[PDB]
């Protein structure tokens, strides 16, 4: 204890020194979830482009394009339509909160 008073250093080298390491080993655990963040965001603004072109884009130019206007009603119009599955989704939620 007197000159094993570097006992206490081992002591502090260790717990101490050991609760050091279990820091960074919750830092790679971060950067699997920030990894992931980005990882997923950019893979998907790349199929939210894939749209733009084929939706607004080749709206306005299939919309100068031109029976055949039965499928011009079908079209644009049947596809906002599309859209009543929000009401499908809002009674839902205004549901399981009362």
Same mark, same amino acid.
């Given at each position: 204890?007197?000159?094993?008073?570097?006992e206490?250093?081992?002591?502090?080298?260790?717990? !101490?020194?050991?609760?050091? !390491?279990?820091?960074?080993?919750?830092?790679?655990?971060?950067? +699997?979830?920030?990894?992931?963040?980005?990882?997923?965001?950019? @893979?998907?603004?790349?199929?939210?482009?894939? +749209? *733009?072109?084929?939706?607004? @884009?080749?709206?306005?130019?299939?919309?100068?394009?031109?029976?055949?206007?039965?499928?011009? *009603?079908?079209k644009?119009?049947?596809?906002?339509?599309?859209?009543?599955?929000?009401?499908?989704?809002?009674?839902? !939620?205004?549901?399981? +909160?009362?």
């Open positions: 204890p007197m000159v094993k008073e570097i206490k250093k081992i002591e502090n080298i260790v717990t !101490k020194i050991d609760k050091k !390491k279990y820091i960074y080993d919750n830092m790679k655990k971060l950067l +699997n979830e920030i990894a992931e963040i980005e990882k997923d965001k950019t @893979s998907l603004e790349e199929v939210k482009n894939i +749209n *733009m072109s084929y939706g607004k @884009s080749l709206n306005k130019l299939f919309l100068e394009k031109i029976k055949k206007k039965s499928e011009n *009603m079908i644009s119009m049947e596809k906002y339509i599309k859209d009543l599955d929000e009401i499908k989704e809002q009674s839902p !939620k205004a549901e399981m +909160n009362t």
